[PDB]
Nucleic acid binder design. Sequence first.
DNA 1: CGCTAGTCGACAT
DNA 2: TCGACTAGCG
Length: 346
Amino acid sequence: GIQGLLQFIKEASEPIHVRKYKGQVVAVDTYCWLHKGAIACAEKLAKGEPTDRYVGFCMKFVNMLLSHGIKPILVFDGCTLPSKKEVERSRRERRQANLLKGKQLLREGKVSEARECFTRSINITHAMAHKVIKAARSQGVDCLVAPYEADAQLAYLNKAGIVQAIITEDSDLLAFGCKKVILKMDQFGNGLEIDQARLGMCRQLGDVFTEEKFRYMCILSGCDYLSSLRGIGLAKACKVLRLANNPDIVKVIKKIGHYLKMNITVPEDYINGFIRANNTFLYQLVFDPIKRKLIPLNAYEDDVDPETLSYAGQYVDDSIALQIALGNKDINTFEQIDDYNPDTAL
DNA sequence: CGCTAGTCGACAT
DNA sequence: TCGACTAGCG
Ligand SMILES: [Mn+2]
Ligand SMILES: [Mn+2]
Ligand code: NA
């Protein structure tokens, strides 16, 4: 997530209700509903005790969407991106830590703080997600498991015209170049909408409303793929991109000390990390629902070599990609754990 | 003013 | 998990 982005472009935000998308299709970052639903039953989940409260929690959101004549496409996270394995491990350590020390806090008597310990140990597994998938598909609601991060898949679904809006809590969608993003939606449909074309309402944003420059801004400020240079936030990065009339971002980053009047040393591997971040935001592998084939988020440009983009995910056979996307194949064991067929009755 | 790093709440009784 | 919020510091 782009920390502070939502407050940085608040002028482009608008309080809405989902009724305005009646008769249209809306994709959903289901992992947020999964997490907020897991919070209610974090105790049983952390203990391994059987529960399915989060299923109902997600399904009342889904039902709420269905009640207003909206077609929801639930999208789920798939395989972990190779550039975040260390990160996921480092987070898993914290989860297990809060789990154990949570159990010890239960041993010592306080539960209100122990609650706060168990709520930070929540690990959304693919099994839970699959439970939600079955629960939704029993209602005729489409479900699609992303090849990797659901962010890029959602971005594709929106930029292709399959859906007209995206329900999420993560601002990464804005960096992926989404047209419309619905944030902070409760059980009743009251949410906050951000339009890409409305980014012009932000005065301090300057002329950084174009998708490319906006992406550059989000990356330079600091994202999940690359940590920002110490002292570089959203405002200063935006200032750099505003003061830079040069289309070549590399020379700009090399002159980031010049555009800001600061003693900023730019390491040579930071440029590599930046290029990788941009290529990940641009060409992360998604799944085409129509053609049923692994494709990059955006079409490969004539300058970039697609052979050196393994950090954006590697390709597999389209059949395997299909069985993975349908949730029929386990992401980890690559074994058939289901046999859904959308044909015999996205 | 801007940025870093840490805290805190979410759900729900 | 992610944003909101804030003390501390350039
Ligand atoms: Mn995500
Ligand atoms: Mn994200
Ligand atoms: Na930053």
